[PDB]
Symmetry: D2
Subunit: 136 residues, 4 copies
């Protein structure tokens, strides 16, 4: 609930994500979910359903990036140290893309996070992402 508002305030600070119309769907002590509307991130004909892979990447980087608020009691923006995204299969067209990330380790200066993109069930994610973030 407070995380919900902090997550939203992180997000609204991001211009490129404004264009993409990302919204926060949920924010627990369990992690963070964001939503990418397919219509804001089309490559080519909007008639066809096709979401730019680069939008999904932004979604994931941002989800990891913001999920840091589930473990930082205060609000800060943690610069990126490392990021890997690996796509398992292409997105379905005409379907919103969700991202989930979840901090799995926290040290004095670094936060490690892991998540995935999916559409229907989290069971067969579009892609996996792992990132480390500096707090300094």
């Amino acid at each position: 609930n407070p995380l919900l508002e902090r997550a939203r305030r992180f997000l609204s600070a991001l211009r490129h994500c404004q264009v993409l119309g990302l919204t926060v769907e949920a924010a627990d002590e369990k992690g963070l979910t964001l939503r990418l509307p397919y219509s804001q991130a089309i490559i080519g004909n909007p008639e066809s359903g096709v979401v730019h892979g680069g939008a999904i990447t932004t979604l994931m980087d941002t989800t990891c990036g913001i999920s840091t608020v589930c473990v930082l009691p205060d609000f800060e923006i943690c610069p990126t140290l490392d990021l890997r995204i690996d796509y398992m299969h292409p997105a379905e067209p005409h379907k919103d893309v969700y991202g989930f990330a979840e901090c799995y380790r926290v040290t004095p200066n670094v936060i490690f996070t892991r998540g995935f993109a999916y559409q229907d069930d989290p069971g067969q994610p579009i892609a996996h992402v792992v990132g480390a973030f500096m707090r300094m």
Copy 2:
């Protein structure tokens, strides 16, 4: 150079969701591809402070690697990302444009592998190293 530059530029223009970043193609040829992200377009926090958002540089570098496929493909096509890693060596300097360079280092029948880096002043001490793989559709 020119034909590959024209292609790279047309390619970039299709990426509408990030056109807000003001990304430009500086150079393209058989040996690789250079894009630029103007810093004013990616500030996080106060515009007075000139700090570039990390997620902007991801886009720059995802986009750079993707488009560098033009350097090896005979025909224009847009190649979906399969895998990307970006590893930041050191923080970007504030109030300075960020450049991305990439070069394809392996081409198979359906996959192109590419390596590059972000930097600001000179390529010598890059901000971040990047490797990605792309699907020839």
Copy 3:
């Protein structure tokens, strides 16, 4: 049969030999190897602490050999890339299992993802992604 191929491949790997790695199962859906903990000890053997480097070998080997799940006949596919991330330490005094499944196959590249775990696959020690060259 697929299983026999997995084992042949593993036996070629003359340098893992020290680790006592075995193939636990192998079907179309993927591959499970095993690292017995007595073969990867750091420090006092009575302390049963598994060396991280052994697990990295385990995961690398599992990915590299998982290519038998999709390849018609025996072939050793060179590494193109490896991504390994550790979620938490291994528990002492327990074997480590490695699982991997090919999730994409192109004419000359095979992409596999896997993880390492001890009791249940539930919360793996580590995640690994890899691509390998074929033909």
Copy 4:
């Protein structure tokens, strides 16, 4: 000198590494060079002599790991947190493989390192590597 003999001692205590016959070629404040003799890497026909990816993974993981001695005053083993390896091209047979690495960021609990593997010419790397390591 003192780094060199500390690097050698870190490496003597690894078993798999001794079967590979890994040695410390060079070590200073700059970073760490390890050697992998080709004979110990061969998979298959020894005359054909194809060097196994796995032996190079061990090489780099170990090089990255031990390079921490350049930045740690006292002896300690730092477990791998994450590793990335990307081959530019296959190793040549019948040539030893050298692994270099150098810490580029040090944090209270994390050391980040980067390096590469090569044979004759350090400017033609067969592979690139970055890893993060924990100090306990």
